[PDB]
Amino acid sequence: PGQSQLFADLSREELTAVMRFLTQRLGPGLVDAAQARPSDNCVFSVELQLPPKAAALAHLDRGSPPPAREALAIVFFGRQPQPNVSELVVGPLPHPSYMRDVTVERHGGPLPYHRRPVLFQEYLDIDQMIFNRELPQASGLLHHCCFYKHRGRNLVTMTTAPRGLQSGDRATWFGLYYNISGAGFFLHHVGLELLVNHKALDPARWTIQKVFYQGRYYDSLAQLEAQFEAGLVNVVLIPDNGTGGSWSLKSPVPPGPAPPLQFYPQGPRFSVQGSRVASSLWTFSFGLGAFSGPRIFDVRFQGERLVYEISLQEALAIYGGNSPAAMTTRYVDGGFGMGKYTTPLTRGVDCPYLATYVDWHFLLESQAPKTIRDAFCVFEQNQGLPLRRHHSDLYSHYFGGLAETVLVVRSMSTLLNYDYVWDTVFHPSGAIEIRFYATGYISSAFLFGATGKYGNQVSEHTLGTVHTHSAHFKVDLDVAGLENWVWAEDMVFVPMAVPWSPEHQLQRLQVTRKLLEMEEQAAFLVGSATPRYLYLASNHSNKWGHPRGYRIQMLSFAGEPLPQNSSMARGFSWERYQLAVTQRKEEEPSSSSVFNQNDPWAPTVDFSDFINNETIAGKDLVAWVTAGFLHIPHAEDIPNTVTVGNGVGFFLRPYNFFDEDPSFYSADSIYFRGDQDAGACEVNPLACLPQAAACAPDLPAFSHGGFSH
Amino acid sequence: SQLFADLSREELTAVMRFLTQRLGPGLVDAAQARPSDNCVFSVELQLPPKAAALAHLDRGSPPPAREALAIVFFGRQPQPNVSELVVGPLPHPSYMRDVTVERHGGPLPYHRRPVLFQEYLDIDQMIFNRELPQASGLLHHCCFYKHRGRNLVTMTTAPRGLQSGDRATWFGLYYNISGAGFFLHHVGLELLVNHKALDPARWTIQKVFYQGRYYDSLAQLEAQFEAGLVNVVLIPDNGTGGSWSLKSPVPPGPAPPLQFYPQGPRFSVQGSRVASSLWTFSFGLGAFSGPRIFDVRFQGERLVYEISLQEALAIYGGNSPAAMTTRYVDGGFGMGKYTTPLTRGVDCPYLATYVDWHFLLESQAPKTIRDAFCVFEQNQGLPLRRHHSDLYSHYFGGLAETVLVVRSMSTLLNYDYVWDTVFHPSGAIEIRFYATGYISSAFLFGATGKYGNQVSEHTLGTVHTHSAHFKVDLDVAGLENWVWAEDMVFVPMAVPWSPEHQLQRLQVTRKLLEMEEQAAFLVGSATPRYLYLASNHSNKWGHPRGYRIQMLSFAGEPLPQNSSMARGFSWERYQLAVTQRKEEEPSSSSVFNQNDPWAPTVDFSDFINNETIAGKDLVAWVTAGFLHIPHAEDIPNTVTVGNGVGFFLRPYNFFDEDPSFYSADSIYFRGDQDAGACEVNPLACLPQAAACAPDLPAFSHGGFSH
Numbered sequence A: 001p002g003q004s005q006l007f008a009d010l011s012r013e014e015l016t017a018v019m020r021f022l023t024q025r026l027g028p029g030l031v032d033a034a035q036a037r038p039s040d041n042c043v044f045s046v047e048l049q050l051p052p053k054a055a056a057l058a059h060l061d062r063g064s065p066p067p068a069r070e071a072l073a074i075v076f077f078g079r080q081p082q083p084n085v086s087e088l089v090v091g092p093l094p095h096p097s098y099m100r101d102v103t104v105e106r107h108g109g110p111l112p113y114h115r116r117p118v119l120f121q122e123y124l125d126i127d128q129m130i131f132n133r134e135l136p137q138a139s140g141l142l143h144h145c146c147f148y149k150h151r152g153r154n155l156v157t158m159t160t161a162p163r164g165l166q167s168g169d170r171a172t173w174f175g176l177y178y179n180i181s182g183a184g185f186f187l188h189h190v191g192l193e194l195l196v197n198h199k200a201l202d203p204a205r206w207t208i209q210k211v212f213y214q215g216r217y218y219d220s221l222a223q224l225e226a227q228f229e230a231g232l233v234n235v236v237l238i239p240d241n242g243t244g245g246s247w248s249l250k251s252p253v254p255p256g257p258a259p260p261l262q263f264y265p266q267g268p269r270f271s272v273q274g275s276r277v278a279s280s281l282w283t284f285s286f287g288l289g290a291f292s293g294p295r296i297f298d299v300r301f302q303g304e305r306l307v308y309e310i311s312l313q314e315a316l317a318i319y320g321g322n323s324p325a326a327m328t329t330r331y332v333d334g335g336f337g338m339g340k341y342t343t344p345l346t347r348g349v350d351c352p353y354l355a356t357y358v359d360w361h362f363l364l365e366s367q368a369p370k371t372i373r374d375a376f377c378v379f380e381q382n383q384g385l386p387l388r389r390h391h392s393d394l395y396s397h398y399f400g401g402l403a404e405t406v407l408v409v410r411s412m413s414t415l416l417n418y419d420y421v422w423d424t425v426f427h428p429s430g431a432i433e434i435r436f437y438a439t440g441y442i443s444s445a446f447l448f449g450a451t452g453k454y455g456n457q458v459s460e461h462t463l464g465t466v467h468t469h470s471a472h473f474k475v476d477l478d479v480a481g482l483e484n485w486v487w488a489e490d491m492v493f494v495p496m497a498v499p500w501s502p503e504h505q506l507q508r509l510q511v512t513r514k515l516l517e518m519e520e521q522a523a524f525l526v527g528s529a530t531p532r533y534l535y536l537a538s539n540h541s542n543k544w545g546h547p548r549g550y551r552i553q554m555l556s557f558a559g560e561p562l563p564q565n566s567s568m569a570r571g572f573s574w575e576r577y578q579l580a581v582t583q584r585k586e587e588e589p590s591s592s593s594v595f596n597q598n599d600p601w602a603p604t605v606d607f608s609d610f611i612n613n614e615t616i617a618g619k620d621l622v623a624w625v626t627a628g629f630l631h632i633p634h635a636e637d638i639p640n641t642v643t644v645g646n647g648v649g650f651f652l653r654p655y656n657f658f659d660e661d662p663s664f665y666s667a668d669s670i671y672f673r674g675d676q677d678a679g680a681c682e683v684n685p686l687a688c689l690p691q692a693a694a695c696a697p698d699l700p701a702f703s704h705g706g707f708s709h
Numbered sequence B: 001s002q003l004f005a006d007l008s009r010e011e012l013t014a015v016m017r018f019l020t021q022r023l024g025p026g027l028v029d030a031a032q033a034r035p036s037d038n039c040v041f042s043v044e045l046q047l048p049p050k051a052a053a054l055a056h057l058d059r060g061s062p063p064p065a066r067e068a069l070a071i072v073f074f075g076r077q078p079q080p081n082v083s084e085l086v087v088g089p090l091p092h093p094s095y096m097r098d099v100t101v102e103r104h105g106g107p108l109p110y111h112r113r114p115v116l117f118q119e120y121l122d123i124d125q126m127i128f129n130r131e132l133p134q135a136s137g138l139l140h141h142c143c144f145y146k147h148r149g150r151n152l153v154t155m156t157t158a159p160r161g162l163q164s165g166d167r168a169t170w171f172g173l174y175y176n177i178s179g180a181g182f183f184l185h186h187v188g189l190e191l192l193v194n195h196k197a198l199d200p201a202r203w204t205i206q207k208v209f210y211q212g213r214y215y216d217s218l219a220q221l222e223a224q225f226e227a228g229l230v231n232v233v234l235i236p237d238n239g240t241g242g243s244w245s246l247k248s249p250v251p252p253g254p255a256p257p258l259q260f261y262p263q264g265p266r267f268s269v270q271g272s273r274v275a276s277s278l279w280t281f282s283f284g285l286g287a288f289s290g291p292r293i294f295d296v297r298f299q300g301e302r303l304v305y306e307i308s309l310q311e312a313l314a315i316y317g318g319n320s321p322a323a324m325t326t327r328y329v330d331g332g333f334g335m336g337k338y339t340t341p342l343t344r345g346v347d348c349p350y351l352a353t354y355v356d357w358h359f360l361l362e363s364q365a366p367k368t369i370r371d372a373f374c375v376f377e378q379n380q381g382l383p384l385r386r387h388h389s390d391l392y393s394h395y396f397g398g399l400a401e402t403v404l405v406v407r408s409m410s411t412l413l414n415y416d417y418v419w420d421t422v423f424h425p426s427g428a429i430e431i432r433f434y435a436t437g438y439i440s441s442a443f444l445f446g447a448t449g450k451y452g453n454q455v456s457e458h459t460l461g462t463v464h465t466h467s468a469h470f471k472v473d474l475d476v477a478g479l480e481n482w483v484w485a486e487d488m489v490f491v492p493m494a495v496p497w498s499p500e501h502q503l504q505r506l507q508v509t510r511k512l513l514e515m516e517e518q519a520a521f522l523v524g525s526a527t528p529r530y531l532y533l534a535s536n537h538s539n540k541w542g543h544p545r546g547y548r549i550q551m552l553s554f555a556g557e558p559l560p561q562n563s564s565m566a567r568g569f570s571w572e573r574y575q576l577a578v579t580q581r582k583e584e585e586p587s588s589s590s591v592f593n594q595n596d597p598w599a600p601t602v603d604f605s606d607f608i609n610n611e612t613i614a615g616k617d618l619v620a621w622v623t624a625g626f627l628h629i630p631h632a633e634d635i636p637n638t639v640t641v642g643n644g645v646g647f648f649l650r651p652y653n654f655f656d657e658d659p660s661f662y663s664a665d666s667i668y669f670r671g672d673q674d675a676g677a678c679e680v681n682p683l684a685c686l687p688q689a690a691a692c693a694p695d696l697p698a699f700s701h702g703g704f705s706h
Ligand SMILES: *[C@@H]1O[C@H](CO)[C@@H](O[C@@H]2O[C@H](CO)[C@@H](O[C@@H]3O[C@H](CO)[C@@H](O)[C@H](O)[C@@H]3O)[C@H](O)[C@H]2NC(C)=O)[C@H](O)[C@H]1NC(C)=O
Pocket: A025, A026, A077, A080, A083, A084, A085, A086, A101, A103, A104, A109, A110, A111
């Protein structure tokens, strides 16, 4: 009816077109982001502006004309007497002709300039101040401890956390580490940690305001030499070569027989075309925000839409430690960007070999579109489980089952050391499983002092620092329509007398159903009682009279939220909740904000604002889910944290939404009575895989979508 | 060794030969037996003692004697009992040996014995030939009564009465639906049969239930119907749509994704031993307790002596007596006994290895359940691990998780339970169970909605909980283990370099749990985030070699303690508990608890009794479950999705570095290489494609119980 693809990310043309539009009317002194100074004017990002929902649905459902495709741009305006970041909407694509400043509309005033993310340039300007005007003042020490030459670069920095202690601060603790080659630098901290202040717009004005060496705090790298020279510093010598997991990543073992391989014996059974995937049961668009990360829209099971949007909103990591970097590190990874940092998927490792892979395009900190090759994979997996089965020996004498095969969509953000895997998986039953693994390397500190309270030793000199991971997701169900209710069902035992034997007691198992009517009644804090059955449902009912529902079951071992006493906790208020449900809104598009990380004491978005007692009885509702877990690192996280058991997320499960299990109708289901031949091709499809069905494809030659330079 | 191998058909035969000659006449085949008879109910492996078995495995000592355990029904005598008799040694038994009093302290009350097949047979005779006809009038207008009730069928329930000693079972009535689930077609009528007498001929019917009303006999019921005081509605006895069928109407399409092993299978199976590059173990089936694995070693080093299923438990709500008073303890029937063939391609991957299983239960000859186990290797389409670096140095390394898997399925009335043990190459072990098959339904007579959902025409989907119990005999770096609990906390502190500013200081929190009840964790109370069994042997970085338990469970609130029945499955009240392993505490429950949980033959909470768990041979007990409120999507079956429950056993400083780092299947390259070159990267190589195909074996099926 409405056949447009209005959820798709911008093409290169589209991106270019918007850049050209902007170039022209920003004007006096627009610099390329990739070399911008603080005092420059800069285009930080250009990406899709999502359509408003009312119009989108009108188009898709009621055949109306589609809304204007627009793009949003972030502009650092540094070349003024009162710098600002600005958000600018630009359309209508593909040939734009207007531009609108929506900053004060969305934020209520101008964006203070320090909120802006640190630029690639800014990182380089810092690393010069470090390696040219600072480390030099301590070649004595460094020649001694850390194999340092002239200046040379054998070391390497890495950033942290918020940057400072107050709204307004821009001061980052940087750890120093050996530039290892072909493997992870994060394990090889050298015990040096500089607190670089960089608020000023003139990099010359940038001071170092504290030093930390191997357990001790000094006021500068001068003092540090003074003492080292004065023999007054006991210095630990940390190697820069080694062998095994803390050094390498290459398995020293030769390839053995081949892992199992999965193929689609007579062609695939889904198809991807643009941002749009379609299979016999399922239909959806998939995307990728620069900063939010992955998203799917307009999901439909057999024609019927369940969810308008499911989308990553934020990712969080909270550290402890001995040493000022980690003890103060609260990463709000959106402020770097889960899209911006998405990475190629290595065919046969990150997804099955025959997955279909799909490029992503972007214009970030640049002036022309680039592309991450193979950023998404989509594939149909045979789970090795049945979805359902029943064997009957009792009375008759039949078998009926179906092997679960499933449809997956994956992307991976790789930020610093972390490799986040994001999955969404679509089940034949009509259920949707969201999963989030964390792999890759481990951020580490130099092992020194009271360890046990702050992690485990994992390699020599190497503390695996304790941290919590948490992720937030937006789940905008539209259960059989916009207007939804949320219900809480649970159990209870009521002690009673056996009706037919009143001497005796029995414990009466009962169901309990309560209707949650206000936003607060459906806001569940971490470590609180949570209804065993929580679902959103329609006013409409199914064929047996029960409300049509989708149940949210969580899979989270959430750590313990940063205490609310912390003046920075407003910057990730969503961590306090397991689950919340809120009235959907155009002014509440996101949980978080790329600007939250560099000023969480004065948040651009405070998710707790969304919970503001309003009815959730029969409105357009959106459910916000938090998933996460505490990580105390240990030896088996070397070289990499492994995915097994680190999976975390939620199901969306149909609860009296249908009138019966859709999989009853699967083409793949199997059935035979005891009185039949089950090794008969006409009774049973599986009887005729061997002769003569399907002959295993020739494989694409391997290839890889490479690295950023 | 073939030390934990269930009994061969030849061995099983030879014990029955012995028991036969040595119990003399009369002694009847249990498939014939009446209560007053003598009877071999079951003959299965007696698992050896740990000490003597480790002796033989770790120190070339000779093997502990191989013994059977026969359960015998001694009805032909003034004082009737059940006896547990050990017989041995195998393969040619010379001795036999009553151990009943040794284990239990008395004899076994005969009313604890499982209902035989004959018993059920007889109970049906009585109902169908001498009871239902008294209401043939009502049953004609209710539900198509005929000849003589060939259109109807019964199903047992839970414990069988209201106190110790009773043997009175509520049975529902259902249409004998052809080639699909009767469980969805409760005809509205429930009978409380009393079958305690040793004379089947003395069997009363204590009570009757119809449409929300209880009578004292079928005759009193048919009376009130004839008197027009009972509104009957005619219940349809056929239909369409998987209320009535399992066969799909939609014809089969292009095939789903097939896995294969390009250069052959990478594991082997000899007898009951599975061997692979990384994992080596033995597997089997307890007739009552079900699936189990032993002597699990990772790269030669033992992690677990034994992991096994102890019990399975379903507890109901309801409008009707049969449901509202139903707590099954499915071990009472037997997960091993009721294990079913695995349908190749559906229950496991087409190219799994499927193993037969032998048993001698309620008969005098051994028989086989074909394709009862499947073992296979499975590509997860997930990386075990991976890092792609664009920062400072350009490389990629990672590895796709393939996983090794053992499975059997128990089918108990309406349920199909799936028992999965999955072996990861991180060195982790994952235990999973899945509830599928049919639900049980009650006939729907309004005032429901505290007890379930209408789920079909005339059917109530009855609320219940599921639970299962696992014994986990971790020998972390030898027998002597301790248990640690670690977790997290936030501590307000001034910021060193800026004391005016505060800061929430995140810290780990560790604690040794010396005494059994420090490590007993009840449902509803909170659990430490990290919890593992340690050796005192430390790893290279100076940390106690550990194996963490991590639980995946949504457990439903357990039957309250106040219930006189509860001691029959006291494990339900715990998520986790750790205990001194003891030869006199082999099992968490017993086959005899079902039929008398008020006088429980084994009560689990006895095992927790203020001993020390600092430095002894520990065994961990894990309870996993969920609340199940049925709904339409459970028609025809309940699906697996989201219903997995179990636990992970995870290395925690057990090794010095992740073992996967030595993987034969690992992939690595730097950007300065040609990732498409076969010898930079084994993925850029082509093994035998097309050319042509995986070669697939001819399909076949185990069959049915005949
Ligand atoms: C954040 O920074 C931007 C850019 O500096 C501010 O927007 C700019 O505002 C000036 C007037 O304040 C606009 O001037 C307009 O066009 C010409 C100059 O080109 C001028 O002579 C006219 O009087 C007219 O006002 C300028 O075009 C505009 N630039 C953009 C790109 O929108 C903005 O006001 C700052 N944000 C806040 C909240 O203060």
